[PDB]
Amino acid sequence: AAAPPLRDRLSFLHRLPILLKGTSDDDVPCPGYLFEEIAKISHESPGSSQCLLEYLLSRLHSSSGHGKLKVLKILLYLCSHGSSFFLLILKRNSAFIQEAAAFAGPPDPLHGNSLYQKVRAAAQDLGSTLFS
């Protein structure tokens, strides 16, 4: 049984309020205290780590730049504070990090290309830590 144990699916459902607050697709920064909260989720079990990766990679791929930026900051924090297992599985999905480092699109009317720039630099920062 290689999928996350049902018990880990259920415990992760109980952690979704933490994650939803920390990755909302808006310009209000993620509160500092949620980073350690997230790291603790990854240390609960391998199954927890797998559920967490599914959530974060889904948001990274699907969100606007605002949510992508929050996910990338969370992932960089997890490089220093998350479980070794979580890092192993994130490494396996390095294609998503390369994709984020290539995020581009049409300029915003107010902010131009600054959000794209931020997102790409955060993904480069994650890559330099995770891939080195």
Tab-separated table of C-alpha atoms in Angstrom:
chain	number	residue	atom	x	y	z
A	1	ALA	CA	0.000	0.000	0.000
A	2	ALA	CA	2.076	2.872	-1.316
A	3	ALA	CA	-0.670	5.604	-1.052
A	4	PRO	CA	-0.996	7.579	2.152
A	5	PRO	CA	-2.802	5.602	4.897
A	6	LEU	CA	-6.428	6.645	5.382
A	7	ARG	CA	-5.549	7.738	8.917
A	8	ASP	CA	-3.077	10.241	7.444
A	9	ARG	CA	-5.652	11.478	4.934
A	10	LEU	CA	-7.996	12.169	7.850
A	11	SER	CA	-5.422	13.883	10.053
A	12	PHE	CA	-4.398	16.015	7.086
A	13	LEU	CA	-8.014	17.087	6.543
A	14	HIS	CA	-7.891	18.415	10.113
A	15	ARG	CA	-4.795	20.491	9.217
A	16	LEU	CA	-6.355	22.132	6.152
A	17	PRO	CA	-7.288	25.352	8.046
A	18	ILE	CA	-3.551	25.964	8.631
A	19	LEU	CA	-2.722	25.376	4.978
A	20	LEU	CA	-5.660	27.323	3.546
A	21	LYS	CA	-4.709	30.366	5.615
A	22	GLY	CA	-1.035	30.071	4.620
A	23	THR	CA	-1.555	29.757	0.844
A	24	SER	CA	-4.556	31.990	0.093
A	25	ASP	CA	-4.271	33.425	-3.416
A	26	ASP	CA	-4.031	37.075	-2.364
A	27	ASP	CA	-1.445	39.735	-1.567
A	28	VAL	CA	-1.605	39.467	2.257
A	29	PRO	CA	1.590	37.685	3.413
A	30	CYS	CA	1.485	34.335	5.164
A	31	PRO	CA	1.775	34.848	8.953
A	32	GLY	CA	5.161	33.814	10.301
A	33	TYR	CA	3.777	31.323	12.809
A	34	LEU	CA	2.262	29.101	10.090
A	35	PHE	CA	5.652	28.090	8.668
A	36	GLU	CA	6.645	26.021	11.697
A	37	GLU	CA	3.091	24.669	11.861
A	38	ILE	CA	3.504	23.379	8.305
A	39	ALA	CA	6.910	21.881	9.050
A	40	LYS	CA	5.356	19.986	11.964
A	41	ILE	CA	2.781	18.492	9.579
A	42	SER	CA	5.581	17.058	7.446
A	43	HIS	CA	7.145	15.406	10.520
A	44	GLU	CA	3.907	13.654	11.588
A	45	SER	CA	4.395	10.684	9.254
A	46	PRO	CA	5.417	9.784	5.706
A	47	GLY	CA	1.733	9.747	4.787
A	48	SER	CA	1.294	13.271	6.137
A	49	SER	CA	4.247	14.401	4.042
A	50	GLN	CA	2.679	12.873	0.931
A	51	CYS	CA	-0.656	14.617	1.542
A	52	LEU	CA	1.166	17.900	2.186
A	53	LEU	CA	3.126	17.612	-1.066
A	54	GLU	CA	-0.050	16.924	-3.055
A	55	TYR	CA	-1.634	20.065	-1.619
A	56	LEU	CA	1.359	22.350	-2.106
A	57	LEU	CA	2.171	21.207	-5.648
A	58	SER	CA	-1.481	21.557	-6.645
A	59	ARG	CA	-1.534	25.141	-5.363
A	60	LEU	CA	1.846	25.925	-6.954
A	61	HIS	CA	0.643	24.807	-10.362
A	62	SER	CA	-2.880	26.287	-10.194
A	63	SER	CA	-2.667	29.554	-8.210
A	64	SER	CA	-2.021	33.028	-9.526
A	65	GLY	CA	1.385	34.506	-8.757
A	66	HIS	CA	0.309	35.461	-5.237
A	67	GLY	CA	-0.396	31.887	-4.162
A	68	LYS	CA	2.593	30.535	-6.075
A	69	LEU	CA	4.838	32.893	-4.127
A	70	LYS	CA	3.433	31.727	-0.785
A	71	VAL	CA	3.911	28.066	-1.706
A	72	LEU	CA	7.502	28.708	-2.805
A	73	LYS	CA	8.278	30.435	0.504
A	74	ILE	CA	6.738	27.512	2.401
A	75	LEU	CA	8.769	24.996	0.376
A	76	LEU	CA	12.006	26.890	1.042
A	77	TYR	CA	11.227	26.896	4.784
A	78	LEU	CA	10.621	23.141	4.604
A	79	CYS	CA	14.126	22.660	3.156
A	80	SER	CA	15.480	23.812	6.538
A	81	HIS	CA	12.728	22.616	8.911
A	82	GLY	CA	10.722	19.838	7.239
A	83	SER	CA	11.094	16.081	7.310
A	84	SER	CA	13.784	14.326	5.283
A	85	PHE	CA	11.043	12.254	3.652
A	86	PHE	CA	9.222	15.378	2.495
A	87	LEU	CA	12.402	16.650	0.909
A	88	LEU	CA	12.964	13.321	-0.885
A	89	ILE	CA	9.504	13.460	-2.440
A	90	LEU	CA	9.849	17.147	-3.319
A	91	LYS	CA	13.102	16.303	-5.090
A	92	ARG	CA	11.221	13.700	-7.126
A	93	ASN	CA	8.885	16.457	-8.314
A	94	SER	CA	11.636	18.928	-9.306
A	95	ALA	CA	9.856	19.493	-12.631
A	96	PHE	CA	7.339	21.684	-10.765
A	97	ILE	CA	10.148	23.854	-9.384
A	98	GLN	CA	11.634	24.349	-12.841
A	99	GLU	CA	8.144	25.268	-14.080
A	100	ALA	CA	7.778	27.908	-11.354
A	101	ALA	CA	11.204	29.358	-12.178
A	102	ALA	CA	9.884	29.795	-15.746
A	103	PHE	CA	6.597	31.511	-14.761
A	104	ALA	CA	5.823	34.234	-17.304
A	105	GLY	CA	2.782	35.999	-18.688
A	106	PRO	CA	1.230	39.295	-19.727
A	107	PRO	CA	2.060	42.340	-17.593
A	108	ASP	CA	-0.298	43.518	-14.875
A	109	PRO	CA	-1.893	46.954	-15.400
A	110	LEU	CA	-0.614	48.262	-12.054
A	111	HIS	CA	2.434	46.181	-11.139
A	112	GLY	CA	3.793	45.263	-14.565
A	113	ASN	CA	5.933	42.170	-14.455
A	114	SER	CA	6.954	42.419	-10.795
A	115	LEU	CA	4.879	39.468	-9.543
A	116	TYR	CA	6.319	37.195	-12.219
A	117	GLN	CA	9.794	38.382	-11.231
A	118	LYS	CA	9.198	37.662	-7.553
A	119	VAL	CA	7.851	34.192	-8.293
A	120	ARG	CA	10.822	33.304	-10.494
A	121	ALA	CA	13.355	34.549	-7.939
A	122	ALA	CA	11.657	32.576	-5.151
A	123	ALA	CA	11.802	29.435	-7.297
A	124	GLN	CA	15.491	30.062	-8.063
A	125	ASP	CA	16.074	30.425	-4.315
A	126	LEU	CA	14.270	27.140	-3.648
A	127	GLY	CA	16.222	25.404	-6.420
A	128	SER	CA	19.596	26.612	-5.163
A	129	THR	CA	18.842	25.096	-1.756
A	130	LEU	CA	17.074	21.901	-2.836
A	131	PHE	CA	19.253	20.986	-5.841
A	132	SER	CA	22.706	21.777	-4.389
